[PDB]
Amino acid sequence: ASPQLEELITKVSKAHQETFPSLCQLGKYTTNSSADHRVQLDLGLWDKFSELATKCIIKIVEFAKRLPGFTGLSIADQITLLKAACLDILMLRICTRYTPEQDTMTFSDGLTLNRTQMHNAGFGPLTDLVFAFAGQLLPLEMDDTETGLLSAICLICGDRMDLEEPEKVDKLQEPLLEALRLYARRRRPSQPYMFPRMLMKITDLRGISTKGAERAITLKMEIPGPMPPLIREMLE
């Protein structure tokens, strides 16, 4: 149907893959830090978790700038969209790295934490709800292209508060929505509820990112200094 749409799919897929390695491509390793009992916070796991979060924020920015038209938005709007969506995309990303058989999540350096360690690294009381979100992503069996498109749709959203040109953002989102439906239906024609199910996960993701911002407030009181500067940028 449209060469332009096919190219958009290819571009978004490549941008995702090049900013987010697949679980299969990573050499996993583990830590024995606070591995068998939940505690309020393990500072060694927090330091590594938060370092890895900073690095992924920079990768999400890199991803965003590869999305067609994103750099043609005002710099203010680019920053507003990134602030509004980066926690959503972080959470989607980590949940895509869930290995159910071991109940672990894997970071982009290969660090593989069990559920107790994810709790102890900072998720705290939000841990099991995030793992349940990850578990309910599994039946969708999304591929990397679908994850990348969904991430783009989450980011390029015209409803965000304080956008200067929300209509322009909406027009950038339209082909991404078209692209995801076309791709998802082509890939699995006998599962036509996959596209609407994927879109409704954006709503679920917003709920868990809202809870994540609430957790950031209590976590701040548990750690001995401020959070890393790019995390604070995301949270404001």
Ligand X SMILES: CCCCCCCCCCCCO[C@H]1O[C@H](CO)[C@@H](O[C@H]2O[C@H](CO)[C@@H](O)[C@H](O)[C@H]2O)[C@H](O)[C@H]1O
Residues that bind ligand X (CB under 6 A): 55, 57-59, 61-62, 79, 82-83, 86, 230, 233-234
The amino acid that residue 117 corresponds to is Q
Handedness of CA 222, 225, 230, 232 (dihedral sign): positive
Query: Is 212 a residue that touches ligand 564 (CB under 6 A)?
Result: yes
> 16 vs 215, which CB is nearer to ligand 564?
215
Query: Is 215 a residue that touches ligand 564 (CB under 6 A)?
Result: yes
> 181 vs 211, which CB is nearer to ligand X?
211
230/179 Cα distance (integer angstroms): 31
Query: Is 56 a residue that touches ligand 564 (CB under 6 A)?
Result: yes
Query: Is residue 187 packed enough to be buried (19+ CB in 10 Å), middle (13-18) or exposed (0-12)?
Result: middle
Query: Is 91 a residue that touches ligand 564 (CB under 6 A)?
Result: yes
Number of H helices, E strands in the chain: 9, 3
Pair 29, 112: CB distance under 8 Å: yes
> 55 vs 160, which CB is nearer to ligand X?
55
What residues make contact with ligand 564 under the rule CB under 6 A? 49-50, 52-53, 56, 90-91, 93-94, 107-108, 122-123, 126, 212, 215-216, 219, 227, 231, 235
